From a paper:
We solved the structure of R28-IgI3 bound to CEACAM1-N at a resolution of 3.05 Å. The asymmetric unit contains four copies of the (R28-IgI3)-(CEACAM1-N) complex (the four paired molecules are A-B). The R28 domain has an Ig-like fold belonging to the IgI3 subset, which we recently identified as a domain in the β protein from S. agalactiae that binds CEACAM1 and CEACAM517. Notably, R28-IgI3 has the following properties of the IgI3 fold: A’ and A” strands, lack of C′ and C′′ strands, and a truncated C strand. We next assessed the mechanism of interaction between R28-IgI3 and CEACAM1-N. In the complex, R28-IgI3 targets the dimerization interface of CEACAM1-N (the A′GFCC′C′′ face) using a pocket of residues (K45, Y61, K64) that have high electrostatic potential. Taken together, our structural and biochemical analysis indicates that R28-IgI3 docks over the CEACAM1 cis/trans dimerization site of the A′GFCC′C′′ face (residues F29, Q89, I91 and L95), and that the unique structural features of R28-IgI3 provide a site with high electrostatic charge (K45 and Y61) and high stability (I52 and I53) for CEACAM1 binding. Thus, the analysis indicated that the F29 residue in human CEACAM1 is a critical determinant of human-specificity, likely through interaction with residues K45 and I52 on R28-IgI3.
This interaction triggers events that would favor the development of puerperal sepsis, including adhesion to cervical cells, suppression of epithelial wound repair and subversion of innate immune responses. The human immunomodulatory receptor CEACAM1 (carcinoembryonic antigen-related cell adhesion molecule 1) binds to some bacterial proteins that contain an Ig-like fold designated IgI3.
Author numbering:
A (entry chain B): 1 to 106
B (entry chain A): 1 to 107
Write the structure that this text describes.
């Protein structure tokens, strides 16, 4: 079959200096690979510098739940992050993207 | 498993100390050194990215600290305020992290 990829919240709007959280869930009948290429590209130094926190709520071979927290939002955090998911047999899941919008504090 | 070694563990004021890392994980994404016993971005000394192969300073960098691709940390012209604990976080390709803390004493 095909892996199931769901991301919550699919879209969110925050203000400046606020934390942004979303959760990515992937599961299948076999070992799944969560595609982190886009997430890594957008927040490489932020992940390494503890500004973006990555928490695996589940790290089973066939089920992975990952929670991403972007702390102290800036207007540059307004953007989109794409995630992919395929099983060992190469059956790809339909990619889902997260939309984030940051608003000035006014 | 992941461990850090202070060489030397007792450093004279104004000398150098190299914090070696040993059991580095298999697939890696980056390293970050933090002053203290906790991983806090406000105390990040320096950061290394596997991809860019570049080293980025942090809020707690005094210019004397330099990280290397082997995850080791070099502090030159050490001061008294440099003494204490240091925390190393290794971010793997799974985006799962391994932490190891070291320390040295300045006399
Ligand atoms: Cl080794």
């Amino acid at each position: 079959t095909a892996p199931t990829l769901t991301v919550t919240p699919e879209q969110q709007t925050v203000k400046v200096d606020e934390d942004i959280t979303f959760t990515v869930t992937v599961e299948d009948e076999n070992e799944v690979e969560l595609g982190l290429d886009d997430l890594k590209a957008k927040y490489e130094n932020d992940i390494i510098g503890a500004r973006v926190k990555i928490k695996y709520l589940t790290k089973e071979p066939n089920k992975k739940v990952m929670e991403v927290t972007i702390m102290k939002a800036t207007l540059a955090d307004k953007g989109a992050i794409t995630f992919t998911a395929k099983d060992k047999a190469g059956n790809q899941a339909e990619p889902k993207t997260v939309t984030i919008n940051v608003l000035p504090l006014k | 498993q992941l461990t850090t070694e202070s060489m030397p563990f007792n450093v004279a004021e104004g000398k150098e100390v190299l914090l070696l890392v040993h059991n580095l994980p298999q697939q890696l994404f980056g390293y970050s050194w933090y002053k203290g016993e906790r991983v806090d971005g406000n105390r990040q000394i320096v950061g290394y990215a596997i991809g860019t192969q570049q080293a980025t300073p942090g809020p707690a960098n005094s210019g004397r600290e330099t990280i290397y691709p082997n995850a080791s940390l070099l502090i030159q012209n050490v001061t008294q305020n440099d003494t204490g604990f240091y925390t190393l976080q290794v971010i793997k390709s799974d985006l799962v992290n391994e932490e190891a803390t070291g320390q040295f004493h300045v006399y």
